[PDB]
Structure 1
Amino acid sequence: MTEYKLVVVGAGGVGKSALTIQLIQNHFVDEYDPTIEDSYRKQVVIDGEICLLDILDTAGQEEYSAMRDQYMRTGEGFLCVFAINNTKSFEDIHHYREQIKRVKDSEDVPMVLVGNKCDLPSRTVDTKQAQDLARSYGIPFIETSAKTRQGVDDAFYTLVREIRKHKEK
């Protein structure tokens, strides 16, 4: 069966680890070592196709590790994550998209913009802002909550759909 290599990137503390653990293990972790970068694997059914997901949950401390460049070169799709209560994390998104495009040496890279923590009442990044950004990038935008599981499957599954279309060119 097809294996899709997904990489989750974003500013520290936006919920990259919580989103992945919720997707893989169906539970909300409220504190996960922020220096730990690992890979998680899950078999899922997306649009009737059985496939395997290999997800890399990046950590900022591990960026200049020997394996980061391998997982970056091997990654087919990227989840660009920000938190809706973190204005700076949203403002940083452009750096991550630029880095991925630079490494892939490609303008068109399968990507999805994710606004995490949508369960929280305090929101400093409005949905209109993220929608405008994703539309200018030509990528989907999905609101998620690792706590309540809202949008978690949709975020990862859409990235898989983005990967499939890129393959069919």
Structure 2
Amino acid sequence: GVFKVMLVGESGVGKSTLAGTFGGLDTYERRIMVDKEEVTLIVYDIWEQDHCLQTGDAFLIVFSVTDRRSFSKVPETLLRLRAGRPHHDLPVILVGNKSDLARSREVSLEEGRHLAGTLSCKHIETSAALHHNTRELFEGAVRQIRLRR
């Protein structure tokens, strides 16, 4: 029961901060409880601007809601990941991070959801800074990976 979740996306969106919420005080491992069953979750924060793609069980494509450029890069990023394992139904979620910065937002909630719906991904918004929805993010990953097994 081992789950490998890869954080990927443009520089500055919050990948390391997201990993930090899971790992506390570039790979983090913990046994967590999801749906009454314990599992080993390893969160990878080794994406650079590969080993990542083959290794992963799930891919969290992180963009920042305050960085429209990072959002525009999502389609081409997802395409490359999927193309590297064309036979696999990869669990993927688009993670709109920095939701706490309301007065700096460059990407809307509904836009994120439309993108995820169009590309057949999951979608969630997080604040890695305040641990808003970060637990839900990683637990959700475990659930989708389970469906692939």
Q: TM-score, normalised by structure 1?
A: 0.83
Q: CA deviation at 1:104?
A: 1.3
| AA partner of residue 166 (structure 1) | R
Indicate conservation of the 8 Å contact 1:112/1:158, yes or no.
no
Aligned residues: 148
What SS is found at the alignment partner of 2:132? coil
Provide the residue aligned with 1:39 in structure 2. 27
Deviations 1:26-84 (A, max 9, x none): x7xxxxxxxxxx211111001111001111102425xxxxxxx3342121100010000
**2:117 alignment partner, one of 132, 135, 145:** 135
Q: CA deviation at 1:166?
A: 1.7
Provide the residue aligned with 1:20 in structure 2. 19
Q: CA deviation at 1:107?
A: 5.9
Partner Cα distance (1:10, 1:96) in 2: 8
Provide the residue aligned with 1:146 in structure 2. 128
Unaligned runs of 5+ in 1: 28-37, 62-68
Indicate conservation of the 8 Å contact 2:7/2:15, yes or no.
yes
Provide the residue aligned with 1:113 in structure 2. 94
Partner Cα distance (2:70, 2:52) in 1: 23
Partner Cα distance (1:42, 1:156) in 2: 11
Percent of aligned positions that are identical: 33
Partner Cα distance (2:52, 2:112) in 1: 27
Partner Cα distance (2:91, 2:28) in 1: 19
Partner Cα distance (1:90, 1:144) in 2: 14
Provide the residue aligned with 1:10 in structure 2. 9
Partner Cα distance (1:5, 1:59) in 2: 14
Unaligned runs of 5+ in 2: none
Alignment of 1:77-92 (within 5 A): 77-92=58-73
Partner Cα distance (1:103, 1:55) in 2: 20
**1:72 alignment partner, one of 33, 53, 68:** 53
Partner Cα distance (1:3, 1:84) in 2: 31
Alignment of 1:83-102 (within 5 A): 83-102=64-83
RMSD across aligned positions (CA)? 1.4
Partner Cα distance (2:87, 2:133) in 1: 28
Q: Does the C-alpha gap of structure 1 residues 128 and 18 become closer, same or farther in structure 2, counting only changes over 3 Å?
A: same
Indicate conservation of the 8 Å contact 2:22/2:28, yes or no.
no
